[PDB]
Amino acid sequence: MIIFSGGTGTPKLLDGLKEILPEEELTVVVNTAEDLWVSGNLISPDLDTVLYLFSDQIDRKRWWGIENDTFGTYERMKELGIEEGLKLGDRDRATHIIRSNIIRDGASLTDSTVKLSSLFGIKANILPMSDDPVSTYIETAEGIMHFQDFWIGKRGEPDVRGVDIRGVSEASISPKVLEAFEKEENILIGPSNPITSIGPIISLPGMRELLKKKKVVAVSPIIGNAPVSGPAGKLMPACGIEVSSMGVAEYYQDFLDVFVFDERDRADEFAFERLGCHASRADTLMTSTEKSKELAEIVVQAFLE
């Protein structure tokens, strides 16, 4: 099974799904539009959380970075009054270097991802959506900037007026991911940001058409009128899509076959039908691995039905 992942929402669903099926059978196509080179090294926030989740070192308190990771280099620079851009731990920085080096030797992002997987001994198959550069810029009333500067740098406070995912047009679906799609027909769209996470992935040239030939199940990242987290609340509207389990469904309307939103939003059954997808409510507020496991079973069943 193939799973499009963001960096929080989906990896949580994965936290439970990796208890339902066999890991080797789980291939994850991770978003890279959030990637960024910091302090001389490439950081793949999304791609990393997934590696860390499966390598069993993810900090479940915030869902980013390694658990009990030290902050030497960081804290030292904090004393000198120099913000690095994001809290980078020592062990976490190792992932950035280990990867970057490989990239520096001519190898690709996927290559590094592979080596990182083998190093962490993760049975699953993590694969960045694309080897080509893609950056998510957020057009705010204060000025156009990078996602990181907006979310972390500005605490997601700026007033968003637009979203610009650059390079996605010139990017190419990772050959390893295309290869994976061949021997697969079940693709899950984790409950992650539709604009800045799934967006970049489905926006890659050929993807949208490739997703049609497969059975696509999706878990709404919106519970009510707003997301469980993240700036999807400002991005989505300012992007055209309405912040609702209904909007999310319309967004993937071109390929979404089975949808699964939260029960707190029981909505028109025939409404979803007009979009051409089988709806279904369920408890999606993953408050623990058990809830993730519980919702994951609901998902595994969605495919089966």
Ligand X SMILES: Nc1nc2c(ncn2[C@@H]2O[C@H](COP(=O)(O)OP(=O)(O)O)[C@@H](O)[C@H]2O)c(=O)[nH]1
For residue 192, the partner it binds in ligand X, its own copies, ligand FO1, none, with Cβ less than 5 to 8 A by kind, is ligand X
x/- string (CB under 8 A) for its own copies, residues 110-149?
Answer: ---------x------------------------------
Please list the alpha-helical segments (H only) found in 162-264: 175-182, 199-203, 207-212, 232-235, 245-251
Please name the helix (run of DSSP H) or strand (run of DSSP E) that holds residue 155, with its range, or none.
none
Pick the binder of its own copies from 20, 100, 237, 278 (CB under 8 A). 100
Of 4, 27, 23, 21, the closest CA to residue 179 belongs to 27
d(Cα 104, Cα 87) in Å, to the nearest integer?
24
Helix axes 109-120, 90-104, angle to 10 degrees: 130
CB distance 204 to 168 below 8 Å:
yes
List the beta bridge partners of residue 217: 188, 258
Number of neighbouring beta carbons within 10 Å of residue 287: 10
Q: Smallest distance, Å, CB 150 to ligand FO1?
A: 11
Q: How many CB atoms lie within 10 A of CB 64?
A: 18
Q: Is the dihedral of CA 185, 6, 235, 36 positive or negative?
A: negative
- 173, two tokens: 């679906």
| Among ligand X, ligand FO1, its own copies, none, residue 9 binds (CB under 5-8 Å by kind) | ligand X
Of 53-61, 192-200, 209-217, 241-249, which segment contacts ligand X by CB under 6 A? 192-200
- Count of residues of this chain found to bind ligand X when the rule CB under 6 A is applied: 23
Q: Is 183 annotated as a binding residue?
A: no
Q: Does 193 bind ligand X (CB under 6 A)?
A: yes
Task: Enumerate binding residues for ligand FO1 (CB under 6 A).
Answer: 43, 45, 48, 64-65, 86-88, 92, 152
Q: Is 87 annotated as a binding residue?
A: yes
Interface with ligand X by CB under 6 A: which residues? 6-10, 12, 191-193, 196-197, 219, 221, 223, 227-232, 284-286
Interface with its own copies by CB under 8 A: which residues? 39-41, 69-70, 72-74, 76-77, 80, 82, 84, 89-91, 93-94, 96-98, 100-101, 104, 119
